[PDB]
């Protein structure tokens, strides 16, 4: 229905992936019998305490995808994944020599009335892989909104496997601030408003509480029907990141003036390792040996409400927003959707769990981020 | 049949105890699914490496018991357990006030024609518990052999529970050198020979390969029928211990001039902790989390032959003498009958596993210990 322009997207989540592995490696009974042991409790040994760096920040990325975006006059179709920290949109060239590219949808400048050359070259060089290509300008549509935007047409794609090959994803659409170019190419959402296609350079994410494979992106205004109560804005502590200054308390474990990043693409709440150990130690939480898995009774009376405090608002997360049931492994068993991981100093991220509770707003004009209590729809 | 005097005794072993616990705590499937995990092998984590001091030397004691020894003229019956390091025999007094004593057989000096007073008091003060009592002299019989021996009649017994209460054992019979008294009370076996009831102060242990609940003690001579090949003697490195000087090699892991103690009452081969870690590391051996249990495929091709070298003889143990099948938990699964434990510096013990292969001789006269290849009877 909405009066502002809204798209659905699909999510592959951490739970879906963990379920996959448990079936690959036949792990249900090992988890079942470990938990029983714990309940008995013949696991006095903690430590547990297992320094599993299995965690890098990319291990925790969900894939948020949609296939109703189109390029140029002819409307060439592409499956993007959203990335919340990047300003640019990225799409395989018809010219792409690599093998990764063979099974994917392609941009063909030749086939588009609206196409303009730019031809400025770009290389993105990374940990997981490397991408070469060139800027082109064409009609970028979603699907009520449309604008001539400068995007990247990728010619060499190496790495990112096996995900890229196994994924039906073509490229990346940018809901962020960082532009690779030095031509000050604005965000897609900035450009819509520059060209007057919307009225404000803003968007929201709405993650419905009851469907963890779905999300909704709304562009150009605040859709009042997704939330109850007031919207609170916090000011960014960074020019180029959806990042905010807050004091964080998990029970008596606390950290003041923490950098907290909003990324609905992350699958969990993250916390520095020290902080996590203070939290989990004697909180009745069980680290299953040889797995990146923390587990507890879903009704655990020791688990605190998590708090993210600003000078005028506190955002909270009860145990039911940070625990995922595992009813098909063990009755009343849940896992923790909290992972320990050290990034920059004193840096935390709010992923999927936080946004299932809070509807969120991402405001390029006013350099703010907005929080409100999601409805259940 | 034998020409020298021979008694059977029963053994409760480590395997019997471990089986008990697995049934108490319902652990079969946890062990099964852990091993599967290992086989997969999703247990890259070693360390494993779990410093379980669950091990003290007493955790590893088997109980070797028999009930055909008798005291005095009237032949008062008692269930002893053998202890290989103690010279004295120990038995509850009829006077014993403690509760431990209530269910046990009792020595009543009054009821014995042959009894002589000694009345010299003795206290044994220990880690697990404390024993007070007094020396008495009476006819100590087993059951072809008999001699007036001075023994201890215990009046206060505190501690040693819950084993003592749950055990049908009354007291302790000493196959060792250490006499608590200062009256130079010889070993029971010395005294037999002093009084000419035997011809040599010697005994053997024969542990049959195929019945791990049974052992045989022979007193006063060498029973030729228990073994094949020659007897080798090593000289004790200690006046009061069944202890011997040897170089020990387990594969490339080695230790020269080690103190190795012969104790068939110990349930395992022991090894210092450092030595054990060097041994087990990349030997394809799996420490089951939260259990004092090391586990491997019974056909493991990496396991070496264990070597105990003297200047003129080496005693060896193949993997089939140091591995116990667990066929009723997992097919072709075995456990290691080797435990890490640091005692004195460079000190090792040969328990049940070694003696299932080697028939052993314990020679008080010549201050030697004798080794030979056990028959299977």
PDB file of C-alpha atoms in Angstrom, chain B residues 34-171:
ATOM      1  CA  UNK B  34      31.965 -37.067  20.380  1.00  0.00           C
ATOM      2  CA  UNK B  35      33.978 -39.790  18.685  1.00  0.00           C
ATOM      3  CA  UNK B  36      31.990 -39.384  15.472  1.00  0.00           C
ATOM      4  CA  UNK B  37      32.786 -35.654  15.574  1.00  0.00           C
ATOM      5  CA  UNK B  38      36.452 -36.472  15.978  1.00  0.00           C
ATOM      6  CA  UNK B  39      36.322 -38.966  13.092  1.00  0.00           C
ATOM      7  CA  UNK B  40      34.904 -36.173  10.905  1.00  0.00           C
ATOM      8  CA  UNK B  41      37.249 -34.441  12.173  1.00  0.00           C
ATOM      9  CA  UNK B  42      35.574 -31.293  13.412  1.00  0.00           C
ATOM     10  CA  UNK B  43      37.749 -31.176  16.547  1.00  0.00           C
ATOM     11  CA  UNK B  44      40.748 -29.283  15.151  1.00  0.00           C
ATOM     12  CA  UNK B  45      40.971 -27.874  18.636  1.00  0.00           C
ATOM     13  CA  UNK B  46      43.411 -29.852  20.637  1.00  0.00           C
ATOM     14  CA  UNK B  47      44.408 -28.848  24.160  1.00  0.00           C
ATOM     15  CA  UNK B  48      43.011 -31.613  24.809  1.00  0.00           C
ATOM     16  CA  UNK B  49      45.405 -30.711  26.529  1.00  0.00           C
ATOM     17  CA  UNK B  50      42.829 -30.566  29.339  1.00  0.00           C
ATOM     18  CA  UNK B  51      44.720 -30.379  32.624  1.00  0.00           C
ATOM     19  CA  UNK B  52      42.470 -32.798  34.506  1.00  0.00           C
ATOM     20  CA  UNK B  53      44.090 -33.517  37.804  1.00  0.00           C
ATOM     21  CA  UNK B  54      41.016 -35.735  38.369  1.00  0.00           C
ATOM     22  CA  UNK B  55      44.094 -37.909  38.537  1.00  0.00           C
ATOM     23  CA  UNK B  56      45.741 -38.327  41.867  1.00  0.00           C
ATOM     24  CA  UNK B  57      47.469 -41.752  42.189  1.00  0.00           C
ATOM     25  CA  UNK B  58      44.573 -43.111  44.339  1.00  0.00           C
ATOM     26  CA  UNK B  59      41.953 -42.493  41.545  1.00  0.00           C
ATOM     27  CA  UNK B  60      43.821 -45.218  39.609  1.00  0.00           C
ATOM     28  CA  UNK B  61      43.934 -47.854  42.296  1.00  0.00           C
ATOM     29  CA  UNK B  62      42.250 -51.124  41.574  1.00  0.00           C
ATOM     30  CA  UNK B  63      41.043 -53.093  44.566  1.00  0.00           C
ATOM     31  CA  UNK B  64      42.597 -56.535  44.740  1.00  0.00           C
ATOM     32  CA  UNK B  65      40.707 -58.519  47.338  1.00  0.00           C
ATOM     33  CA  UNK B  66      40.503 -61.952  48.868  1.00  0.00           C
ATOM     34  CA  UNK B  67      38.565 -63.609  51.692  1.00  0.00           C
ATOM     35  CA  UNK B  68      40.395 -66.846  52.539  1.00  0.00           C
ATOM     36  CA  UNK B  69      42.838 -65.365  55.124  1.00  0.00           C
ATOM     37  CA  UNK B  70      42.230 -66.243  58.792  1.00  0.00           C
ATOM     38  CA  UNK B  71      43.459 -64.997  62.188  1.00  0.00           C
ATOM     39  CA  UNK B  72      44.151 -67.030  65.336  1.00  0.00           C
ATOM     40  CA  UNK B  73      43.417 -70.547  66.659  1.00  0.00           C
ATOM     41  CA  UNK B  74      39.683 -70.252  65.878  1.00  0.00           C
ATOM     42  CA  UNK B  75      40.314 -68.986  62.306  1.00  0.00           C
ATOM     43  CA  UNK B  76      38.509 -65.644  62.231  1.00  0.00           C
ATOM     44  CA  UNK B  77      37.686 -64.769  58.590  1.00  0.00           C
ATOM     45  CA  UNK B  78      38.537 -61.452  56.895  1.00  0.00           C
ATOM     46  CA  UNK B  79      38.361 -59.866  53.433  1.00  0.00           C
ATOM     47  CA  UNK B  80      41.661 -58.070  52.836  1.00  0.00           C
ATOM     48  CA  UNK B  81      42.741 -55.882  49.973  1.00  0.00           C
ATOM     49  CA  UNK B  82      46.376 -56.162  48.969  1.00  0.00           C
ATOM     50  CA  UNK B  83      48.641 -53.117  49.095  1.00  0.00           C
ATOM     51  CA  UNK B  84      52.047 -53.543  47.488  1.00  0.00           C
ATOM     52  CA  UNK B  85      53.941 -50.779  49.324  1.00  0.00           C
ATOM     53  CA  UNK B  86      53.001 -51.663  53.046  1.00  0.00           C
ATOM     54  CA  UNK B  87      54.661 -54.396  55.197  1.00  0.00           C
ATOM     55  CA  UNK B  88      51.874 -54.668  57.836  1.00  0.00           C
ATOM     56  CA  UNK B  89      48.471 -56.396  57.973  1.00  0.00           C
ATOM     57  CA  UNK B  90      45.512 -54.430  59.287  1.00  0.00           C
ATOM     58  CA  UNK B  91      42.177 -55.639  60.633  1.00  0.00           C
ATOM     59  CA  UNK B  92      39.173 -54.081  62.498  1.00  0.00           C
ATOM     60  CA  UNK B  93      39.115 -54.618  66.255  1.00  0.00           C
ATOM     61  CA  UNK B  94      36.069 -55.920  68.010  1.00  0.00           C
ATOM     62  CA  UNK B  95      36.707 -52.738  70.089  1.00  0.00           C
ATOM     63  CA  UNK B  96      36.174 -50.455  67.075  1.00  0.00           C
ATOM     64  CA  UNK B  97      33.867 -47.588  68.071  1.00  0.00           C
ATOM     65  CA  UNK B  98      33.494 -45.963  64.614  1.00  0.00           C
ATOM     66  CA  UNK B  99      30.495 -46.549  62.333  1.00  0.00           C
ATOM     67  CA  UNK B 100      32.577 -47.661  59.332  1.00  0.00           C
ATOM     68  CA  UNK B 101      33.513 -50.727  61.438  1.00  0.00           C
ATOM     69  CA  UNK B 102      29.942 -51.825  62.280  1.00  0.00           C
ATOM     70  CA  UNK B 103      29.266 -53.884  59.110  1.00  0.00           C
ATOM     71  CA  UNK B 104      32.769 -55.481  59.018  1.00  0.00           C
ATOM     72  CA  UNK B 105      34.429 -58.622  60.366  1.00  0.00           C
ATOM     73  CA  UNK B 106      36.223 -58.092  63.665  1.00  0.00           C
ATOM     74  CA  UNK B 107      39.225 -59.438  65.519  1.00  0.00           C
ATOM     75  CA  UNK B 108      38.481 -60.532  69.050  1.00  0.00           C
ATOM     76  CA  UNK B 109      41.700 -61.247  70.961  1.00  0.00           C
ATOM     77  CA  UNK B 110      39.567 -62.879  73.731  1.00  0.00           C
ATOM     78  CA  UNK B 111      38.245 -65.621  71.385  1.00  0.00           C
ATOM     79  CA  UNK B 112      41.675 -66.909  70.297  1.00  0.00           C
ATOM     80  CA  UNK B 113      43.749 -69.584  72.148  1.00  0.00           C
ATOM     81  CA  UNK B 114      46.837 -68.451  70.196  1.00  0.00           C
ATOM     82  CA  UNK B 115      46.591 -64.671  70.703  1.00  0.00           C
ATOM     83  CA  UNK B 116      49.426 -62.885  72.460  1.00  0.00           C
ATOM     84  CA  UNK B 117      49.156 -59.355  73.739  1.00  0.00           C
ATOM     85  CA  UNK B 118      51.500 -56.721  72.401  1.00  0.00           C
ATOM     86  CA  UNK B 119      49.273 -53.620  72.962  1.00  0.00           C
ATOM     87  CA  UNK B 120      51.833 -51.205  71.432  1.00  0.00           C
ATOM     88  CA  UNK B 121      49.758 -48.303  70.013  1.00  0.00           C
ATOM     89  CA  UNK B 122      49.822 -47.135  66.359  1.00  0.00           C
ATOM     90  CA  UNK B 123      48.280 -44.206  64.448  1.00  0.00           C
ATOM     91  CA  UNK B 124      48.338 -43.843  60.658  1.00  0.00           C
ATOM     92  CA  UNK B 125      47.493 -40.261  59.652  1.00  0.00           C
ATOM     93  CA  UNK B 126      46.655 -39.631  55.988  1.00  0.00           C
ATOM     94  CA  UNK B 127      45.168 -37.511  53.207  1.00  0.00           C
ATOM     95  CA  UNK B 128      41.963 -39.597  52.719  1.00  0.00           C
ATOM     96  CA  UNK B 129      41.671 -40.601  56.403  1.00  0.00           C
ATOM     97  CA  UNK B 130      43.052 -41.596  59.817  1.00  0.00           C
ATOM     98  CA  UNK B 131      43.414 -44.973  61.649  1.00  0.00           C
ATOM     99  CA  UNK B 132      44.259 -45.596  65.367  1.00  0.00           C
ATOM    100  CA  UNK B 133      44.809 -49.042  66.905  1.00  0.00           C
ATOM    101  CA  UNK B 134      47.319 -51.387  68.475  1.00  0.00           C
ATOM    102  CA  UNK B 135      49.644 -54.244  67.601  1.00  0.00           C
ATOM    103  CA  UNK B 136      48.498 -57.738  68.464  1.00  0.00           C
ATOM    104  CA  UNK B 137      50.209 -61.090  67.689  1.00  0.00           C
ATOM    105  CA  UNK B 138      48.249 -64.110  66.520  1.00  0.00           C
ATOM    106  CA  UNK B 139      48.225 -66.943  64.006  1.00  0.00           C
ATOM    107  CA  UNK B 140      47.967 -65.403  60.480  1.00  0.00           C
ATOM    108  CA  UNK B 141      47.035 -68.112  57.933  1.00  0.00           C
ATOM    109  CA  UNK B 142      46.797 -68.188  54.064  1.00  0.00           C
ATOM    110  CA  UNK B 143      45.450 -71.001  53.805  1.00  0.00           C
ATOM    111  CA  UNK B 144      48.198 -73.644  53.376  1.00  0.00           C
ATOM    112  CA  UNK B 145      50.686 -71.272  55.090  1.00  0.00           C
ATOM    113  CA  UNK B 146      50.477 -70.172  58.775  1.00  0.00           C
ATOM    114  CA  UNK B 147      52.606 -68.186  61.205  1.00  0.00           C
ATOM    115  CA  UNK B 148      52.463 -66.173  64.447  1.00  0.00           C
ATOM    116  CA  UNK B 149      52.692 -62.640  62.988  1.00  0.00           C
ATOM    117  CA  UNK B 150      52.349 -59.255  64.671  1.00  0.00           C
ATOM    118  CA  UNK B 151      49.515 -57.302  62.986  1.00  0.00           C
ATOM    119  CA  UNK B 152      47.419 -54.201  63.696  1.00  0.00           C
ATOM    120  CA  UNK B 153      43.993 -54.319  65.212  1.00  0.00           C
ATOM    121  CA  UNK B 154      42.294 -51.002  64.364  1.00  0.00           C
ATOM    122  CA  UNK B 155      40.139 -49.189  67.011  1.00  0.00           C
ATOM    123  CA  UNK B 156      39.320 -45.801  65.405  1.00  0.00           C
ATOM    124  CA  UNK B 157      38.699 -45.665  61.635  1.00  0.00           C
ATOM    125  CA  UNK B 158      37.678 -42.276  60.221  1.00  0.00           C
ATOM    126  CA  UNK B 159      37.612 -41.328  56.533  1.00  0.00           C
ATOM    127  CA  UNK B 160      38.150 -43.551  53.478  1.00  0.00           C
ATOM    128  CA  UNK B 161      34.441 -43.207  52.742  1.00  0.00           C
ATOM    129  CA  UNK B 162      32.528 -43.768  50.700  1.00  0.00           C
ATOM    130  CA  UNK B 163      34.734 -46.652  49.501  1.00  0.00           C
ATOM    131  CA  UNK B 164      35.204 -48.430  52.830  1.00  0.00           C
ATOM    132  CA  UNK B 165      31.447 -48.564  53.632  1.00  0.00           C
ATOM    133  CA  UNK B 166      30.407 -49.608  50.134  1.00  0.00           C
ATOM    134  CA  UNK B 167      33.296 -52.169  49.934  1.00  0.00           C
ATOM    135  CA  UNK B 168      32.998 -55.692  51.440  1.00  0.00           C
ATOM    136  CA  UNK B 169      36.714 -55.245  52.417  1.00  0.00           C
ATOM    137  CA  UNK B 170      37.697 -55.432  56.098  1.00  0.00           C
ATOM    138  CA  UNK B 171      41.401 -54.588  56.184  1.00  0.00           C
TER     139      UNK B 171
END
